[PDB]
């Protein structure tokens, strides 16, 4: 699960 | 804006596009885990209804809230930019009266 610091596509 | 123990995060999700069961519990755990790098959390509420994707948070101290707001504001979360803003203590307590006497640090549900 990774959501923090994930930039847009 | 004057610093308090309480803040609101926005743009964390869009309730219309959240299908997976217990998604709000996973958001809560995402926020608790991240705030453990600062000074932890004593109350959190994931707003499942507002289109803005709001999370309310109370830290054990003003210092812990300042560290959390400064580190969370302007971060990317799931491809979107999140905002963190202070909430005055009486506004927060009107919304969430049980947070007035919260003292215990919260632990995420998942491992």
UniProtKB/Swiss-Prot annotation, chain A:
Taxonomy, superkingdom: Eukaryota
Location within or outside the cell: Nucleus
Signal peptide start and end residues: none
Record family assignment: Belongs to the splicing factor SR family.
Subunit structure: Interacts with U2AF1L4. Heterodimer with U2AF1. Binds unphosphorylated SF1. Interacts with SCAF11 and SNW1. Interacts with ZRSR2/U2AF1-RS2. Interacts with RBM17. Interacts with PRPF19; the interaction is direct. Interacts with POLR2A (via the C-terminal domain); Interacts with PRPF19; the interaction is direct. Interacts with POLR2A (via the C-terminal domain); recruits PRPF19 and the Prp19 complex to the pre-mRNA. Interacts with KHDC4 (Isoform 2). Interacts with ZRSR2. Interacts with the SF3B complex composed of SF3B1, SF3B2, SF3B3, SF3B4, SF3B5, SF3B6 and PHF5A.
Protein function: Plays a role in pre-mRNA splicing and 3'-end processing. By recruiting PRPF19 and the PRP19C/Prp19 complex/NTC/Nineteen complex to the RNA polymerase II C-terminal domain (CTD), and thereby pre-mRNA, may couple transcription to splicing. Required for the export of mRNA out of the nucleus, even if the mRNA is encoded by an intron-less gene. Positively regulates pre-mRNA 3'-end processing by recruiting the CFIm complex to cleavage and polyadenylation signals.
Name the record gives this protein: Splicing factor U2AF 65 kDa subunit
Source organism per UniProt: Mus musculus
Gene: U2af2
UniProtKB/Swiss-Prot annotation, chain B:
Any single biological process term in GO: regulation of transcription by RNA polymerase II
Keywords, in A-Z order: Acetylation, Activator, Isopeptide bond, mRNA processing, mRNA splicing, Nucleus, Phosphoprotein, Repeat, RNA-binding, Transcription, Transcription regulation, Ubl conjugation
Disulfide bonds: none
Residue runs in coiled coils: none
Primary localisation category: nucleus
Domain RRM: start-end pairs: 26-89
Subcellular localization, as worded in the UniProt entry: Nucleus
Function: RNA-binding protein that acts as a pre-mRNA splicing factor. Acts by promoting exon inclusion via regulation of exon cassette splicing. Also acts as a transcriptional coactivator for steroid nuclear receptors ESR1/ER-alpha and ESR2/ER-beta, and JUN/AP-1, independently of the pre-mRNA splicing factor activity.
Family: Belongs to the splicing factor SR family.
Name of the molecule in the record: RNA-binding protein 39
Gene for this chain: Rbm39
């Amino acid at each position: 699960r990774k959501y923090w610091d994930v930039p847009p596509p | 804006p004057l610093a308090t123990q309480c803040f609101q995060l926005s743009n964390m999700f869009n309730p219309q596009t959240e299908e997976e069961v217990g998604w709000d519990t996973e958001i809560k755990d995402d926020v608790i885990e991240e705030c453990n790098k600062h000074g932890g959390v004593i109350h959190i509420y994931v707003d499942k209804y507002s289109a803005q994707g709001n999370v309310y948070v109370k830290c054990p101290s003003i210092a812990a809230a300042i560290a959390a707001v400064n580190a969370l504001h302007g971060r990317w979360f799931a491809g979107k930019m999140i905002t963190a803003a202070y909430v005055p203590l009486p506004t927060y307590h009107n919304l969430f009266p049980d947070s007035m006497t919260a003292t215990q640090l919260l632990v995420p549900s998942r491992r």
